[PDB]
Amino acid sequence: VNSFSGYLKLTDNVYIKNADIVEEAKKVKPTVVVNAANVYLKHGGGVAGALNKATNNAMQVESDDYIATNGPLKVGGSCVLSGHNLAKHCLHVVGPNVNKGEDIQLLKSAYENFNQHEVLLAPLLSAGIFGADPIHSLRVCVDTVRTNVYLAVFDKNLYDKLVSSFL
């Protein structure tokens, strides 16, 4: 039993809700919140910009030190950093950005990072400003993640389409 509330159950391990991931994280304080990161951990917009803003830019400060030490992530890769005031940890995961021409096949590799964590609050990878089809992202999530994932979808219209079209 966990404290996630109001989710629709899609499969044994995947749950979905129309919610603002920032507000969800602040309420639940999950062990792991997933960020829709880029390889430079520049949290300018989309989910990343919103999460970082909620940390009063502390996420960005920590991220800049991480990059200065380690260099950029790989597309499809991840790193674990602090969750600041939102979660114990933030798993920064880089899905392919279609608006940069990146290979959508890397979306499965991106979701594989979730399997290193027993329970996660997450957005749909590569959705939103990353340019991929969110219906496809949900399919890859369900077919790749085996741990317990609670998906927050900001757009109510999109949430309804994701549910109604789910096979």
Ligand SMILES: CC(C)(C)[C@@H]1CC[C@H](CO)N(c2ncnc3[nH]ccc23)C1
């Ligand atoms: C449109 C984007 C590529 C930016 C993605 C797409 C999937 C959903 C749709 O809104 N996104 C979010 N989900 C949950 N919480 C969120 N907080 C802020 C954004 C957001 C944004």
